[PDB]
Amino acid sequence: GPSFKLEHPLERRQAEAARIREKYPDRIPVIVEKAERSDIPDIDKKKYLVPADLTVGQFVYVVRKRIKLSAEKAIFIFVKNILPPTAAMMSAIYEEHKDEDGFLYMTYSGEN
Amino acid sequence: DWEIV
Numbered sequence A: 001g002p003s004f005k006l007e008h009p010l011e012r013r014q015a016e017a018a019r020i021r022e023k024y025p026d027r028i029p030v031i032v033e034k035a036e037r038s039d040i041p042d043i044d045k046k047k048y049l050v051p052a053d054l055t056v057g058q059f060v061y062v063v064r065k066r067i068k069l070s071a072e073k074a075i076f077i078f079v080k081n082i083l084p085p086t087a088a089m090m091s092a093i094y095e096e097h098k099d100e101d102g103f104l105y106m107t108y109s110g111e112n
Numbered sequence B: 001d002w003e004i005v
Helices: A010-023 A056-064 A090-097
Strands: A027-034 A047-051 A076-078 A104-109
Touching: A010 A027, A027 A090, A047 A056, A056 A076, A056 A090, A090 A104
Parallel strands: A027 A104
Antiparallel strands: A027 A047, A076 A104
């Protein structure tokens, strides 16, 4: 389930956000974690630095490449429990939903 | 460790 804030206090999270946003000024730092109630498998990687104009849909494909699911099985990515538009830019999602720490938090699930 | 997309 969501664990990044469990495992790191605000100060460490903000410091990592500041560090990475200085090093990659045009990228959006995204934390992708399993939805609390889903039994879907683990994804290979939690932390993604995405181009600001990547679309949500392009990002869903990125995430789907880092999980092993039988071909009939669904995946969904949410931002604060909202299903974002595949045509939206990640920059717009970030503006609407970024955390106080500087990251964008998203969850993935086998259920919608 | 960040995945550069």
